């Protein structure tokens, strides 16, 4: 069994007939049943993508007044997903239709895109250009954005439901 990425489960031996343009021919067939190994793609592709999405969602827990920090954070997360998607698809055959891992990568990429859009929407409603001083009981200060407050629940929840549906559909 000189297989790297496959497990040879077994063989099925059979016989049949083929009716060609020149006549009927007996055809003896064997079928080797192979199952792919998934651990490589878990460690190299799925799990870094999951952690990058978790990073993109961690932006919601930073204070809204750190505009450059969250901007750089989201855009660099998008760049990281671009790199991961490129590396992932380098290791596929050039099929037309979409594989499962392609759908996973696309959904994660959409998630980081939506996280950056969420930060943009939060920043649009920020009033004051200074953060909490550290020694005041709430000069006025920006309130915690409702958008951030419920995005902290909506985004990880939606990602978890997508993960459950994905890993139930295929496994």
């Amino acid at each position: 069994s000189r297989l790297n990425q496959y497990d040879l489960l077994g063989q099925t031996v059979d016989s049949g007939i083929v009716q060609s343009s020149t006549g009927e021919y007996v055809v003896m067939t064997t079928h080797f049943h192979l199952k792919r190994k998934i651990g490589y793609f878990v460690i190299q592709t799925y799990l870094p993508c999951i952690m990058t999405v978790i990073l993109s969602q961690v932006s919601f827990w930073l204070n809204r007044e750190s505009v450059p920090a969250r901007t750089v954070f989201g855009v660099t997360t998008v760049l990281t997903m671009t790199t991961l998607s490129i590396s992932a698809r380098n290791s596929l055959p050039k099929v037309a239709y979409a594989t499962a891992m392609d759908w996973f990568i696309a959904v994660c990429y959409a998630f980081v895109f939506s996280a950056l859009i969420e930060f943009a929407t939060v920043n649009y409603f920020t009033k004051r250009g200074y953060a909490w001083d550290g020694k005041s009981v709430v000069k006025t200060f920006n309130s915690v954005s409702k958008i951030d407050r419920l995005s902290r629940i909506a985004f990880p929840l939606l990602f978890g439901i997508f993960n459950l549906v994905y890993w139930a559909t295929y496994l």
């Epitope: 099925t12 007939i17 079928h31």
Partner: nanobody, 108 residues
Framework: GSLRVSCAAS????????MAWFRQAPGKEREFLAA???????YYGDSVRGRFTISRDYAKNSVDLQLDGLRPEDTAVYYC?????????????????WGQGTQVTVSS
């Protein structure tokens, strides 16, 4: 008596899939009858070898089963199935697509 049971597939192209016919007599046992693969290679069950003929129209994405020499015990429900044969090609579990079925009866 002679008969021909056709099966048209819609919603997906089954060029690469193995299209097969199964039989189910009363008593709940499914019996493999015939199958054709992408290579036009015909596999048959021992009970119906040389009697039933399976063919495929890949352009129309259909599979036909010609039944010749019917006997009373052939009365059963015939199912059209498709799917790549993994661990199978003679087992119903290897097929992920199934038809509604067609009842066939023979009277003497």
């Amino acid at each position: 008596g002679s008969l021909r049971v056709s099966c048209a597939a819609s919603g997906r192209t089954f060029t690469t899939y193995i299209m097969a016919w199964f039989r189910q007599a009363p008593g709940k046992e499914r019996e493999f009858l015939a199958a054709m693969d992408q290579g036009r290679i015909q596999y048959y069950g021992d009970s119906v070898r040389g009697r039933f003929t399976i063919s495929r129209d890949y352009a129309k994405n259909s599979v036909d089963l010609q039944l010749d020499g019917l006997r009373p015990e052939d009365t059963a429900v015939y199912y059209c199935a498709a799917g790549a044969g993994f661990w199978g090609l003679r087992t119903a579990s290897s097929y992920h697509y199934w038809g509604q079925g067609t009842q066939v009866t023979v009277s003497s």
